[PDB]
Subunit: 278 residues, 5 copies
Amino acid sequence: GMEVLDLVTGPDSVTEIEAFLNPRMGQPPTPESLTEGGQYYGWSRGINLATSDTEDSPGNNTLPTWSMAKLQLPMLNTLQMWEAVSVKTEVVGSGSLLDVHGFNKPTDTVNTKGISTPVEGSQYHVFAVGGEPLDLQGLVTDARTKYKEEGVVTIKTITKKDMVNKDQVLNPISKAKLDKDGMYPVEIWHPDPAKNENTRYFGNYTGGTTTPPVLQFTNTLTTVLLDENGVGPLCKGEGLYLSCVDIMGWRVTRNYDVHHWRGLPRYFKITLRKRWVK
Amino acid sequence: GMEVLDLVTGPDSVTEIEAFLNPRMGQPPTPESLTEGGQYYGWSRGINLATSDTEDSPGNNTLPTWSMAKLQLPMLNTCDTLQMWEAVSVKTEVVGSGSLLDVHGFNKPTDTVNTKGISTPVEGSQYHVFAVGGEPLDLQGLVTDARTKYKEEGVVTIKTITKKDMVNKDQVLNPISKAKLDKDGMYPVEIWHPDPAKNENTRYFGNYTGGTTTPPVLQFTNTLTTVLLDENGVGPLCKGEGLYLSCVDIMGWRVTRNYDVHHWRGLPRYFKITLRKRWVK
Amino acid sequence: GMEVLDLVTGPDSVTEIEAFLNPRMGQPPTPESLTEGGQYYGWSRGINLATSDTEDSPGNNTLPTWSMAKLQLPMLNDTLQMWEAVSVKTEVVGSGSLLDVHGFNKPTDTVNTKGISTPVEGSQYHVFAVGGEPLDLQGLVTDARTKYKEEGVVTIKTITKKDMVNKDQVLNPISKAKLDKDGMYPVEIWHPDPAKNENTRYFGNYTGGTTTPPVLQFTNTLTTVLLDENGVGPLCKGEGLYLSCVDIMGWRVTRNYDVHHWRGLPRYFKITLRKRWVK
Amino acid sequence: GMEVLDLVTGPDSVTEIEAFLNPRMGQPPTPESLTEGGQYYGWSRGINLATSDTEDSPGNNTLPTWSMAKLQLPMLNTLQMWEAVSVKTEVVGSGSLLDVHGFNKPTDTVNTKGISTPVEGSQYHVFAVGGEPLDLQGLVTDARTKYKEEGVVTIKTITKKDMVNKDQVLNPISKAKLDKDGMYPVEIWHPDPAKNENTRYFGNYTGGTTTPPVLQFTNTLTTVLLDENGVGPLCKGEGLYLSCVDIMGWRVTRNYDVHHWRGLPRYFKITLRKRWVK
Amino acid sequence: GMEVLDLVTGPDSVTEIEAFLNPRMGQPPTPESLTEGGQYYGWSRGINLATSDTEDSPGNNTLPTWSMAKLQLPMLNEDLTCDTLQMWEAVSVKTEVVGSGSLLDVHGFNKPTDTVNTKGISTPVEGSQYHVFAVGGEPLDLQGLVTDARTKYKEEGVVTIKTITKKDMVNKDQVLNPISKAKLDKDGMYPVEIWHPDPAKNENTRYFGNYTGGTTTPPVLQFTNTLTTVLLDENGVGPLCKGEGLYLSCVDIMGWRVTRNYDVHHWRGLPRYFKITLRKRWVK
Ligand SMILES: CC(=O)N[C@H]1[C@H](O[C@@H]2[C@H](O)[C@@H](O)[C@H](O)O[C@@H]2CO)O[C@H](CO)[C@H](O)[C@@H]1O[C@@H]1O[C@H](CO)[C@H](O)[C@H](O[C@]2(C(=O)O)C[C@H](O)[C@@H](NC(C)=O)[C@H]([C@H](O)[C@H](O)CO)O2)[C@H]1O
Ligand SMILES: CC(=O)N[C@H]1[C@H](O[C@@H]2[C@H](O)[C@@H](O)[C@H](O)O[C@@H]2CO)O[C@H](CO)[C@H](O)[C@@H]1O[C@@H]1O[C@H](CO)[C@H](O)[C@H](O[C@]2(C(=O)O)C[C@H](O)[C@@H](NC(C)=O)[C@H]([C@H](O)[C@H](O)CO)O2)[C@H]1O
Ligand SMILES: CC(=O)N[C@H]1[C@H](O[C@@H]2[C@H](O)[C@@H](O)[C@H](O)O[C@@H]2CO)O[C@H](CO)[C@H](O)[C@@H]1O[C@@H]1O[C@H](CO)[C@H](O)[C@H](O[C@]2(C(=O)O)C[C@H](O)[C@@H](NC(C)=O)[C@H]([C@H](O)[C@H](O)CO)O2)[C@H]1O
Ligand SMILES: CC(=O)N[C@H]1[C@H](O[C@@H]2[C@H](O)[C@@H](O)[C@H](O)O[C@@H]2CO)O[C@H](CO)[C@H](O)[C@@H]1O[C@@H]1O[C@H](CO)[C@H](O)[C@H](O[C@]2(C(=O)O)C[C@H](O)[C@@H](NC(C)=O)[C@H]([C@H](O)[C@H](O)CO)O2)[C@H]1O
Ligand SMILES: CC(=O)N[C@H]1[C@H](O[C@@H]2[C@H](O)[C@@H](O)[C@H](O)O[C@@H]2CO)O[C@H](CO)[C@H](O)[C@@H]1O[C@@H]1O[C@H](CO)[C@H](O)[C@H](O[C@]2(C(=O)O)C[C@H](O)[C@@H](NC(C)=O)[C@H]([C@H](O)[C@H](O)CO)O2)[C@H]1O
């Protein structure tokens, strides 16, 4: 699989596959009930704050995590491998943020009037396509943060030891692979630029508290995945890995300004071709 | 035909058609009377808010919906090889942003201490989408709140399609919740989004900018052409000579002097589409 | 001028002309006196507000209007010649003047009446057009009930001889005009008509809000090509060249009841034209 | 130098020259003393306001003016002229705006705490390179403004008459040339688009009062000065004119919100070549 | 070293080297203890303000400084007297600021957004941002320029204009004073509010910078592994590594966090990754 040779031609030598990845903002897909917690699906549960400089214990369901899927491609086997050539990707549903008729904190709080404040604030959009899991590099705001041990994969899960001060900057010890959906918090785990030779990733961040969310969408834009040498990600064991996170901001409730993260689903249409290798 | 062959040449092989789609912000075109509701045409009616976490029922006339039109093209159709109209390009323009420079009206004023200043111009969340295709725009439903009590008359919602109430998956991507944009002023834009899993025969282009007092921004020129050809050089092909135009152009809200009532503002969109005849098999 | 043929060659087959159009924000150029109203030239007079939901009567001098000029080109004439507008270099001049924050506007510290004189801010509108005939206009208003003056401005009612209808708040094809007079057509009413203007190129942008920072760029190195997809620029009917524009920078605000005055800036045009054979 | 002919080849036919222009925000370079006014060098003195609608008398040291320099090129004389082909220009010192530890108006005025508010507000960046002085067109906010007669060059300096109402728009009578450093106020004098055939200028303006200042800087960007015919500015009598202004905004003091303009220096590196002319 | 000739071909004629530079916002990497000050690593200590117009004495640990590293490349010339030599040439760099996602932590103990009830969210990092990186074949040349020539910077612990000149700053140091120059030859020592890339030098370095000001400005960052910055000049020549030394320099300030105690601000910085492609170049 090391030496990359000619493209393979002939029947079924090119394929397209599509997938959507639902966001993982904190509330899991179940319970489905719209009274017992399912009404928060697509959102986090209410963000809970530290009680002191030394007591920061966020709930698992308040922490957005990476979405990921591993897709199995047609069996193939000088061997052949599937090569990801390009991707059309789209974040769906920004129009739903035009709902300003709900029960959020209103724009006129004196009289409880105006409109229901739309989703605003910090936004984070990353997607990746690769032929193996996305390589992750840990880096946190606060190495003292007391993440739960169960239900979430954090730096301590990997090292078996408490975070160190270097984890607030770049600590090469704190690395992982995005091998599970809805488990790796995005406030901890970042694409690792020192690895990911077989993955392309693309991200942006906009911060603030009331920042207007911005999003574009079209079915006419293709992201090429080929590297400088004309070679796309090569799918080891015919596995294709898709990873993303799409945070639009928070809604704010009428009770103590409780914030809920809002995420939106991402569509992928990947074009792949067979490549000779040895 | 599924197989796309050569361009047709000769007399009348290329045509240009134009249309404007008026916005559908909530108030219908009629009554025309400027005292009986017609004064809100181009706008929504006053946005009504939920009364609790479990009671959110927006008025239909408070919900912007998609604009659409189906235009009939000239009839077409050895008779073993057929012809279809192919949409090559579109010049499209949102008209009327200058009208937002009216700051002399009776909106909430900028100085509420003296009730002075200027009439606050339209501001806030903005949403601009257009599409051109050879069949209706494919729609994917996704809502803020699956508990929202959308009206069961006068509007097409997820429940219209499924015959069942919305579920938690409708707040993310639920592949069951799909529709086609086959009616003007009927599909709310807060529910129905272009479906990237379909629309093989339509090109769509959209953007969203949120917030409450965000300055609206717009550009307009008659010098810009959008090419509609795909990677293979093939534009949307008009099934049964029908051309579908879809759009929505929300500029923000105006706010009244009475308990900050908000009204959505929309603007009309112009389309000039160039089509050519294409041989198909 | 139906069929467009070869370019004309030879002596004086290419020409260049320049003009500036001063803004039309509401105060006319006269009286010139700086105590009798001339001090507002380049600005509107104080924006006056509706007194009810059914009583909106703006003063003519509070409404920015389109600037326009028709320039006469050198006389030319089966096969005739027309002047063809090839490109334009255009610039909005004087943004540096907005750096005057030492005047008597509403100050930045209203608590103590201190700080600086608040600079021009808010809603901005920049459009220019170059064509071989008047700019085609499409009417569209915020409020079809607005009571524009009958004299002194050209409005929808001027054209139709009838009151505005609700369709005038969206696209009503009946409500059309031509930009044939300077300082007469309000920009909150009259927009470039995308369904016409085959022989004019226009370019516009809008940024709204109340305190939005104005933005402007300027350079003498930027050329706007006016040729269409077929390589044909606007053709000047009867050797007339039409220039149209509006350049609103925002408002200044006074210390008296937050009265707003629109601010506009002049626009420079330098048009390159060439002779074109036509049949 | 009427007709422009071929490029001159051979030894020393191409030259590079560099210069920095310090900003002229209102306080002159002297006195140097940091207690006698020198502490304001790089800044204006405190902006003074009109006392009524008819009494606007700005101090000279509150008005930013154009920076300019005339550089002498190697002597040359079918004659030859120096042709400016390109310029690399940069505004230096934006990092200094990261000083938020001084005694400006603080971010928390309720308690007088936080940080020293950094420079913010209206920004103005223009540079020009030409073979003769930059041509200026006058245009003011207020034709009634009572500028000082001595110490600044204003419209009245040129016309010998008071400003007229047309000076608030485009009045072709009100023209000048940028022939002195630190003398022509930028709120009065603008690049004249009806002239400047032998100069290239590039400008932008961003307004507001608390607007975040933005600046990019790199040594990898070249501005080509050649016109549509491949001809750059031709230096009359071997003189090269550099003109600029780089306003970053204002700092605000803790005393009645007094504002001081902040300017930054601009670097220029001009490439010139010999040109045959007739 | 001066005259640039053909590219060298053959085995190991092209190489790639990578490095990360951690931010230098004010708190040093040690002590490591999360109770003794290590909890501030990645941040400045609390910004302290002037007490009058003539008394501005910032603490060293409140001043972000330039990050830098010198990488030693494989030696090329056994004999420097040969009429033709080889040098490493930096062709391009992939660079990335890592960890912006960590700013999505709004669950800590910063000043909260609901100050009436002490609720809402922990206010995220906001405000003034500064991103510069450089790659060159010798130290980055620095030009001094300060807000206030009266600022009483410590004499020990930071390299300032006075460190270089041995004299107090002059009023000209508030604009361009060509006397006030230095080289970025040490990590975590040169304050970024004092020292700027010198556009009059740096012939053998490429630098790229941007500044965004304000106090509550939303921070913005992009990251991808698909973006290459080309380092070749107008003649097709990249930085040439003098004595095989490659210099990397950067600063990446994201803004401040604000505490619940007197709105004390702490600068936040993020690390920067570099992957530099270099090739051997014949020179004489
Ligand atoms: C219901 C509750 O209080 N849950 C606590 C939880 O308390 C458990 C148990 O449920 C409770 O009966 C018992 O008295 O105490 C035990 C143990 O303490 O304790 C956990 C910590 O272990 C949490 O503190 C939890 O509180 C929830 O925490 C979530 C974050 O993990 C989140 O903040 C919840 O906030 C929301 C929510 O997302 O559910 C915010 C939301 O806006 C609210 N919705 C509305 C319409 O107001 C809801 C709502 O108040 C509650 O869900 C109850 O209907 O809370 C927070 O409750
Ligand atoms: C007129 C009214 O009260 N309408 C109610 C409606 O009341 C019905 C019935 O129509 C009415 O004649 C009767 O008195 O009572 C019954 C039942 O109570 O009930 C419906 C059902 O939900 C609505 O509540 C309706 O209220 C209107 O709802 C609209 C949204 O669907 C919108 O919010 C209307 O608000 C506006 C408007 O857009 O018309 C907002 C606008 O800014 C206002 N304009 C001005 C100049 O003030 C108008 C204005 O108050 C009224 O239209 C004048 O009657 O209302 C809202 O009225
Ligand atoms: C002076 C006045 O109030 N004028 C009215 C006008 O009244 C006329 C006549 O002029 C007056 O002497 C008489 O008492 O009444 C008659 C008829 O009623 O009536 C018209 C309507 O037909 C207007 O209401 C007009 O008021 C002016 O309207 C302008 C817009 O059309 C504008 O708002 C004027 O406001 C300014 C101005 O732009 O001139 C705002 C400006 O900021 C002010 N300048 C300063 C330094 O304060 C001036 C200034 O107050 C006045 O011009 C007095 O010198 O007013 C508005 O006055
Ligand atoms: C010192 C003073 O009052 N200067 C006046 C000047 O007064 C002269 C003379 O100096 C004075 O002793 C005498 O009593 O009166 C005469 C003439 O009346 O008069 C001129 C007009 O001719 C000015 O009004 C001047 O005031 C200064 O004007 C500057 C603008 O030209 C500027 O606003 C000055 O404001 C600053 C400054 O820039 O120097 C603003 C600055 O933020 C302040 N610094 C601090 C740390 O507070 C300083 C400071 O207050 C003074 O410099 C005193 O050291 O003032 C303004 O003073
Ligand atoms: C602790 C203190 O006051 N330190 C002073 C320092 O005082 C030393 C000595 O530590 C102290 O015991 C004694 O009273 O006096 C000596 C000598 O005077 O004096 C220096 C000046 O020489 C400083 O004034 C220092 O104060 C610290 O200054 C830092 C900037 O250099 C910074 O502002 C510190 O502020 C923080 C911090 O960054 O550590 C801000 C931070 O948000 C705070 N964290 C929390 C959770 O509140 C901490 C915290 O209050 C202190 O570290 C104590 O735990 O302070 C500032 O303290």
